Symmetry: D2
Subunit: 226 residues, 4 copies
Amino acid sequence: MRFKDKVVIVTGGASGIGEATARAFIREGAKVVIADFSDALFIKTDVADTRAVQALIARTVENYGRLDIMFANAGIAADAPIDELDEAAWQKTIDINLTGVYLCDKYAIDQMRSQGGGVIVNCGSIHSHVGKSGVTAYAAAKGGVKLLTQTLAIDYGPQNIRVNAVCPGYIDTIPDDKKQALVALHPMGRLGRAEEVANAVLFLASDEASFVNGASLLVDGGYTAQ
Amino acid sequence: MRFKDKVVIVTGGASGIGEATARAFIREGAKVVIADFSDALFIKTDVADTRAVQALIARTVENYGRLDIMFANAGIAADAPIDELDEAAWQKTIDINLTGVYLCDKYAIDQMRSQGGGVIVNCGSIHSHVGKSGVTAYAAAKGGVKLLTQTLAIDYGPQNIRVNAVCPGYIDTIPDDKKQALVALHPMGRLGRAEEVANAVLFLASDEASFVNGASLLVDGGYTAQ
Amino acid sequence: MRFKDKVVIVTGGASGIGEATARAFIREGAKVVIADFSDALFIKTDVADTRAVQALIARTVENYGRLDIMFANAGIAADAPIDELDEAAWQKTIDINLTGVYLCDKYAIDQMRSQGGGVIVNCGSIHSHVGKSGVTAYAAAKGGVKLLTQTLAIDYGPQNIRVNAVCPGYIDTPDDKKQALVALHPMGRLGRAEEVANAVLFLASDEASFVNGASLLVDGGYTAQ
Amino acid sequence: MRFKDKVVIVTGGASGIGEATARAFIREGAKVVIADFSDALFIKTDVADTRAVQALIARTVENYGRLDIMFANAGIAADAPIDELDEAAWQKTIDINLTGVYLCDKYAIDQMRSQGGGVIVNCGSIHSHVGKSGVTAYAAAKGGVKLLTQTLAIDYGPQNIRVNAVCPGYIDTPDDKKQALVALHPMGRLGRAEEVANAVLFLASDEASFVNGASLLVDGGYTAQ
Ligand SMILES: [Mg+2]
Ligand SMILES: [Mg+2]
């Protein structure tokens, strides 16, 4: 149990990668707060809303006395090629997938600086690195997450805070032919599992990654290698 | 004169890189529309405002009959380390430097698809690639611009549209010691000139770059090489 | 105890990162073969010599039955700006740091294909990604290791083999030169060999079961700026 | 006419990209020396042989007085998945595609330093950035060329030399194999040698006066996805 009594916030924690990661942190002894739009302690939070994010962190600290680890993972996938992507759809993805990471990072960092250290893992993507047809707002957001991660690592690295991104390929959580086409882009010959992303998050959040800072860890079966 | 009678929009065109680029396109025979918040045809445009962007492109087409080249360059630099960066400052940079590029790209692409082709150059940055202390919102925005550029190249590449990013280092356009510290990060031993960025933009916008698509062209004296 | 009875080769195993990595694998239950130019079973091996590399792998398989994990880590640092870098110095770095990785990877992959799977961790560097003054042959070698890692991941990913690279920053293993190196790492210190070992064990483990073709930077922020 | 009386060497100059590049430089007023294993002055040169490379550069300087631009482009494509890639095939690709670039760059830089400046364009590849099935030695070589380019830009950038890499996708120079390659390029066709030449001339020109240490992809979108 590598996370005994560590206080962890997982955003987007009610499903998929977030749920697998919260479950893994609980298994390893952490005190976990799950934040999501809807249903470990659950706290409803719109990560695009600064007051809700501040309240999330404040409540966590009031309940447990500290915040050790933030996994800023909330995100939507609701996208289109640009000619079909309307402004409200673009903005919703930027709000949640990029601004939400800024907000969660900002208020986690304030708390961690007051403690003399902490660890952040941001949810990036293969699409922090490469684009794809129809993946317009999501790629833009995830590219921003990568760069945000890097600047934070530079500013807060010297202050005993590490900030890294996990960058998943496609995860099994659609038409058969659409699914086989996705599979064909991953050299390992299958999609990932959510627990496989969780495992990487726990590595980055742990002292096993004590000199890993500002890095993107691709969990993508080889997708970005080609 | 490589751009005789080509219709070009330059956003952020009233100063710095935008002004140098507009001037270069005019010298090479283009019909240029300069768009900026304030004072070639000038059209006041808030690039964060979808109706103003639509009107910019509509007016350009009404005046000149077509749009051949868009340089989506508007941007602000008004930033801080995250602990000092308030939400309104973050949002203003995301709005202008990222959403403004989406808007300009979106409505340029609609016009170019109706013509059977065109060329976009987006203004990226060294900070599409690397972070820097205190460069929080700007890095996030520019990282997003890079990825947006890549997806557009993938979606619209097959439709005779090329989309690339120019990625400048620091350009001479501050305390002496701050300036020498910036200079020290550029292996060529000086900051760039705006006309040097313009030259790259014209290359990417030209048929000399006819198989260049989805690419970032670093104009940074070596900054990102180390 | 993530590596109980797993058979591991660590090249460059007699010092620094290789030494720490072998010790870490031993702690976690592995049967470890250490390979190096000179002094866990130790087998003296010149990684630039194909007959030696083949013999290393054959002897590991003869002793322990199989080869689960290869950490291809041997490497020299003896470099110069190009105007001062002699052809023999260039060649020696390429031979050990790049061709040595090809050879170790090639013959590990033959065994891994035969036995139905396995895992390779190549030792890259920050200099798989960024150059630096006076780091000419070593950067070329490490850039090569990164791309080699990627192609291998693509070819052998479908064959139950994963191939990844660990990419260390500067590791503490002339005060003013040291402080200059430290100033390039945002975390404010050089890395430890043990920290690189930790990353190797992650990449070699079933915790990294969908990590393939990746470079994991262990650099305190060096490449982030 | 951007290159009036500029002295240029193009290695691998007898065909494809090298040929197109030399022709483009000649159109624009340059004095061009073409170097290749066999057939603008032509000088037969094995780029993997240091004496030959030194002789190439010396003869260019003796004939024309100086060396303004080096396009280090020689390169072979003869590769295989690692399990099929013999040591001699690996070595030949490394020798020509990586060590050849080191040698051309080294002796160009000596001349350029002596004369007070100059410009180098190295031929990288999409495979300086991404791997591909069966592209083992060539990807390693090209990854090496990218990092070599970066270190050179750092060391020699302050000395009025710029060093950059052009990185072509597949260039049209077995229908089903061709269509598969084409499907990987979003623009819907393979590139032309002339399109790579255009990028070389840009990077070699004063239009690229602040471009240093960069890789310019000429790939129709290949690496973007
Ligand atoms: Mg790709
Ligand atoms: Mg850097």
